[PDB]
Design a protein around this nucleic acid. Structure first.
Lengths: 129, 129, 129, 129, 129, 129
RNA sequence: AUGAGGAUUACCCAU
RNA sequence: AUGAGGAUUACCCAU
RNA sequence: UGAGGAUUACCCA
RNA sequence: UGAGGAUUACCCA
């Protein structure tokens, strides 16, 4: 097919959407970044390897910029204060069929669906209670 | 009043929906499992920690089982052929606003939306190209 | 530009076609895998290195699986009864021009063309006679 | 019956065709050589052995010469500036039927079909990208 | 859709133009070579690395050959009399905007524009005075 | 001739052009800088030496200021955050004639020509893909 | 703390 | 990391 | 190097 | 066994 295309990472309904696009493919590690300074950009990387005899493993990483009081194109230090890092590791047994995998994706979509426990906690600087 | 509620992890249009419910909160780790035997249950765990002086870290894990019946010693037992493991870590600076966090959530959602690169690859048993 | 795309490995008319898509490309080794269970997938790997000062060397590898189900304890998994392994090494001197290479490729294609000694022998569990 | 006959190794339309004919078949190793100076000839060898109790193993070898004249002391001899060396090993389990073999052969033919990743890379002094 | 495309390295008005094409991307190093034998080809390589926590470094190399024919052992081989090597390293802070980078590109272009000091000296086999 | 004259480094078509001019010649190392504080200036240096028995080598260095959110004449720390550094090394065999050198220059101009892979990647905080 | 480190998975490994 | 360090050129050298 | 083996980018002389 | 080398049915770990 060729899935390495640009896509919408943050959907604000047309107005203010954040689109991320192909920016690197060194070592099979695909990368997408928004149209920003790399210090203030949205970054997404993803790769697959066979972690072991009977397991394959996808490693996905996301970097999201702190936007409140942000200064576009400015030098903001320390970097750790202005960025959030997401690191996902997905282990899938070599026996999983496409169907099995489709389900695994659905579970991930469900986990983060709007209004569910986890996404709500995160969106409110909260934990579970 | 409490965000520790049950939610549908896998949505199949109200029929075959894998719904998960609160099952434990011992040791600051919120757990959720499906209505199966502990050996065949879908499991979701979450925990927040002030990882650093200026950071907070959410640790989330999901277990997707391949339910099966095994004849161990002439007797049938409900078991899992294998399990797929999702493990994600999210680091957020303390300086992040509630709006800054909503941004992070929206991004994770857009990341896994149907048709986009990553979920397409996972469901197809392929890499990004 | 990119030649690390998916292609048809086995041509069975239009339906039954075995297609192999990119999966990984780490450490200078490109890898293609057919869809569905990694356990029953076809695999193809390729790499090129400068073997010596005068020669460049290609190493192609192909795995053909014998799709089968495996029942153990009443638990059935998608597996491969066995696999056929092809491994080839092509050495080409740095003096070879694009024309010399096209010729080398034609030789390989001719060696396997239908009806010729070698593919015929292989296709019939035979040797030469 | 006999498959140890001459065949076209390189197909250049009808004229320019490189044909290789049987030359020797000692010690279980069949050998084909193109006509004229053995020094500038194309060579092809093939053999099959029972590698282990379960597997049979084919070993095919092809040599592509770079025809050139060599003058030394005013004495010119027909030689080969250099040679390109192809060596492949195909392992097939004794459980493979004639159908399984025909499939394995189709995979090899597909791997080298024109326009596919590998033959393209080779034909252009390239690797994968 | 991909910036890894062929391009004309040396422009001689469409006649004698040295055009270079993608040839390899193994190990995160993008390669391009001309349609010659590997021994007489123009070669261009590029790679980006996050050299520091706050920097990114592009490493670019170009090889310009002096094509020639050498009689080694009475036999003629296509070779290079000598090669000229260009090696440039560019360090860009992560804080650089896309506009900040365009500025860098424009500068490098102006640096080598015909008639300016540096290219004038290089083409004249002299220094700056 | 006397090539050590002022020239246009960044060409914005008259309006906003950046002209760099002679500022130092200590030790044969020619320098040009823009009309700015040395902390915010565009700097260009260049020298030639015979690196070895049969090689001459030009060393060219360029410094480009981060302009987005820049404060003219202000004190901006850290320096590494507000500046990009280019370092080119050009090795030319002593056999290269003026013609050979003219070509070497053309290859450099081509490499960085507008719309080509490299300059496009750089201008977009990207790598090759 | 970091790892496109591993897992039988709230554990283990390396720097 | 730095070098107006070297190369047969994705390598090597010094601090 | 190998008409060396394989559990196929691993291991033997 | 080897994305080990070759002067290609040879030789190295």
């Amino acid at each position: 097919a060729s899935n390495f295309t640009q896509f919408v990472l943050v959907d604000n309904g047309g107005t203010g959407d954040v689109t991320v696009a192909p920016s690197n493919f060194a070592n099979g590690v695909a990368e997408w970044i928004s149209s920003n300074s790399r210090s203030q950009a949205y970054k997404v990387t993803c790769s697959v390897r066979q972690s072991s005899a009977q397991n394959r493993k996808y490693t996905i990483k996301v970097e999201v910029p702190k936007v409140a009081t942000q200064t576009v194109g400015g030098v903001e230090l320390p970097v750790a204060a202005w960025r959030s890092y997401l690191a996902m590791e997905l282990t899938i047994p070599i026996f999983a069929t496409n169907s099995d995998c489709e389900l695994i994706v659905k579970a991930m979509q469900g986990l983060l669906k709007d209004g569910n426990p986890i996404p709500s906690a995160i969106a409110a600087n909260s934990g579970i209670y």
